[PDB]
Amino acid sequence: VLLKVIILGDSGVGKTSLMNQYVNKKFSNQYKATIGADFLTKEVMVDDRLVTMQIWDTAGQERFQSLGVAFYRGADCCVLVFDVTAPNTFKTLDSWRDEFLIQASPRDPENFPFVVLGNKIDLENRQVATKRAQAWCYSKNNIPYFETSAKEAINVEQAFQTIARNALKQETEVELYNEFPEPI
Numbered sequence: 001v002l003l004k005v006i007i008l009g010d011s012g013v014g015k016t017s018l019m020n021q022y023v024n025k026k027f028s029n030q031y032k033a034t035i036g037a038d039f040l041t042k043e044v045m046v047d048d049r050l051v052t053m054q055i056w057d058t059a060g061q062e063r064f065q066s067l068g069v070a071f072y073r074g075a076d077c078c079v080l081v082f083d084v085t086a087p088n089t090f091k092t093l094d095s096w097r098d099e100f101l102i103q104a105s106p107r108d109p110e111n112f113p114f115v116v117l118g119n120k121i122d123l124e125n126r127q128v129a130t131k132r133a134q135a136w137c138y139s140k141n142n143i144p145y146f147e148t149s150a151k152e153a154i155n156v157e158q159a160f161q162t163i164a165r166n167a168l169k170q171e172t173e174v175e176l177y178n179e180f181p182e183p184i
């Protein structure tokens, strides 16, 4: 069982840092723009079951985005990341959510698993309030929200445990749908 997870969000919010903290327990203050989309794989235990997570890191800069997007299809979970110190990055979440739905075209979009990460909470200059972020998540059919720090490894393991569990649930349903579709 391979679980495909896609991480989306504006340039600089910490997508690559979150993935590298989780997969490699390493963090760099140095910024290196992500070009295109590619993945790291990690074997993880999901509620006592072994699965391989294919975690796709993507370019936040539009000029660096891959032209091809076939990889979104079949995705099991989409991670939306914003920077709590940068309100513009929280305001683009609907566009990211919509781009994911359009490229992945999942059946039953309202129940597709999304997980939102408000990153860089270690910084002193926060501008996006937890209540405002939670209100948005609730309005998107109650998606899970975690405040993280990739720099200080705060809530990273916890967020990815829910990402893995929800992605497994989704993979499980798609497989069931293919073999036993429910009637109309």
Ligand SMILES: Nc1nc2c(ncn2[C@@H]2O[C@H](COP(=O)(O)OP(=O)(O)NP(=O)(O)O)[C@@H](O)[C@H]2O)c(=O)[nH]1
Binding pocket: 009, 010, 011, 012, 013, 014, 015, 016, 017, 018, 028, 029, 030, 031, 032, 033, 034, 035, 058, 059, 060, 061, 119, 120, 121, 122, 123, 148, 149, 150, 151, 152
């Ligand atoms: N203080 C702090 N800095 C962070 C955190 N996560 C990432 N950064 C810093 O923020 C900058 C951008 O991080 P990066 O992971 O490259 O962001 P990204 O979303 O992958 N950008 P892109 O879409 O362009 O590839 C880096 O200098 C990194 O060190 C965090 O939790 N706290």
Ligand SMILES: [Mg+2]
Binding pocket: 015, 016, 017, 032, 033, 034, 057, 058, 059, 060
């Ligand atoms: Mg990156």
